[PDB]
């Protein structure tokens, strides 16, 4: 049959804290299969499942240094949405953005998603077209115009259609 | 394969 | 470690030949790749990216298609003119995954058209 | 029109002596900002790239060493110390990060070593 890959990366801003909780989870057929978390000490991306036992050091080393450059995004882009929004300092907010890649029994994308919502409310997503966007409200407008001008829907999309159904079809193959 | 650091800001 | 190589310092053609920039890197991941003008007296400016297997760049009718197999990323232009006299720069997007901003440019080539 | 301003445009230094170079962003399109040194070789290095303010960095090159200041939303400083060899630097700016969005060069701060 088909399949899926998914992650969902959340920042929640804190109260007392400042710095803020964030997380990825990545998903194979809605099975979590990595995780990073952090509030853990030193932090690292880690394998959820044995057939995640061998993809060698390099590979987590270098996505542990994406989350800990992807928190200095969320935490950019939260502080960005208060302006937005026009709410105050040292609230609880959280932003969750939701990717991945369905492909059919041949491998062959089916659908791609960039899902962005800020406080549990949907913000921008792209299209199934992996083309133009549809923003919830006027807030969502300045980002979806930035990402119109930047052409940030063909960016999105070389991950979708490119690296995302590559390493699908390779966690297919690690774990039958 | 999780993706890059955001190339763009909201 | 990660790396651009442009086979050639410079290139001399007359008007109408045939010209290829060879551009060789090494970069594991996903890495855009670029090419970049430097015109005479003037600051380097974009020419055009491919950020995908196989997806031909161009523009001022030059190309070049991202070969992920040879590494290659080789600009091509079939009839140049007097006006392309330049130094092209090939050039390696940051392929860790961390977005520094980082671009890995090669030595450059001087490229003179002769009239 | 034009997106960037460069002072000085040029300088004579001492072998030595400090010199220091500002960036102006002239349009918020475009409010990631970088540094890179072209040496008298013609070779392009990327120095650093700058977004909020208060962001400094250090760095160390044969020929320079350097002190880069993202000073305000438009403003860009770089500090260029013990100098030995001549090169010239622009500042360039971005949509985005880099690994994807093209790098529009500013006119350059060209600096000459004399002994």
């Known amino acids: 049959g088909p399949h899926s890959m998914r992650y969902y990366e959340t920042a929640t801003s804190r109260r007392g804290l400042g710095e803020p909780r964030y997380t990825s989870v990545g998903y194979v057929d809605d099975k979590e299969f990595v995780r990073f978390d952090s509030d853990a000490e030193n932090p690292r991306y880690e394998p959820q499942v044995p057939w995640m036992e061998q993809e060698g050091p390099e590979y987590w080393e270098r996505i542990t240094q994406v989350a800990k450059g992807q928190e200095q995004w969320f935490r950019v882009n939260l502080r960005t949405l208060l302006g937005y929004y026009n709410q105050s300092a040292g609230g609880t907010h959280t932003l969750q953005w939701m990717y991945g890649c369905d492909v059919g029994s041949d491998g062959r994308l089916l659908r791609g998603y960039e899902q962005f919502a800020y406080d549990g409310c949907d913000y921008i997503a792209l299209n199934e077209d992996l083309r133009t966007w549809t923003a919830a409200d006027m807030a969502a407008q300045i980002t979806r115009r930035k990402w119109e001008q930047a052409g940030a829907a063909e960016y999105y999309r070389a991950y979708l259609e490119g690296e995302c159904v590559e390493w699908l079809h390779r966690y297919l193959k690690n774990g039958n | 394969h999780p993706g890059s650091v955001n190339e763009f800001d909201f | 470690m990660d790396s651009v190589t442009q086979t050639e310092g410079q290139v001399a053609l007359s008007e109408e030949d045939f010209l290829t920039i060879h551009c060789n890197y090494s970069?594991?991941?996903?890495?855009?790749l670029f090419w970049y003008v430097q015109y005479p007296g003037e600051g380097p400016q974009f020419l055009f990216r491919?950020?995908?297997?196989?997806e031909k760049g161009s523009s001022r009718g030059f190309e070049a298609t991202y070969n992920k197999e040879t590494t290659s990323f080789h600009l091509q232009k079939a009839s140049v003119q007097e006006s392309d006299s330049a130094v092209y720069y090939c050039?390696?997007?940051?392929?860790?995954?961390?977005?520094?901003?980082?671009?890995?440019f090669g030595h450059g080539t001087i490229l003179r058209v002769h009239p | 029109m034009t997106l960037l301003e460069q002072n000085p445009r040029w300088r004579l230094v001492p072998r030595g002596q400090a010199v220091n170079l500002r960036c102006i962003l002239k349009?918020?399109?475009?409010?990631?900002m970088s540094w890179y040194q072209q040496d008298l070789q013609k070779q392009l290095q990327w120095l650093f790239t700058?977004?909020?303010?208060?962001?400094?960095?250090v760095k160390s090159l044969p020929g320079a060493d350097y002190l880069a200041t993202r000073v305000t939303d438009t403003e860009l400083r770089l500090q260029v110390a013990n100098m030995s060899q001549g090169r010239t630097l622009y500042c360039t700016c971005?949509?985005?990060?880099?690994?994807?969005?093209?790098?529009?060069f500013g006119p350059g701060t060209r600096l000459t070593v004399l002994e």
């Open positions: 970069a594991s991941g996903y890495p855009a």
């Open positions: 700058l977004r909020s303010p208060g962001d400094k960095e």
């Open positions: 971005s949509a985005g990060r880099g690994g994807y969005a093209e790098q529009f």
């Open positions: 050039a390696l997007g940051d392929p860790t995954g961390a977005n520094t901003g980082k671009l890995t």
């Open positions: 349009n918020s399109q475009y409010p990631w």
């Open positions: 491919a950020s995908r297997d196989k």
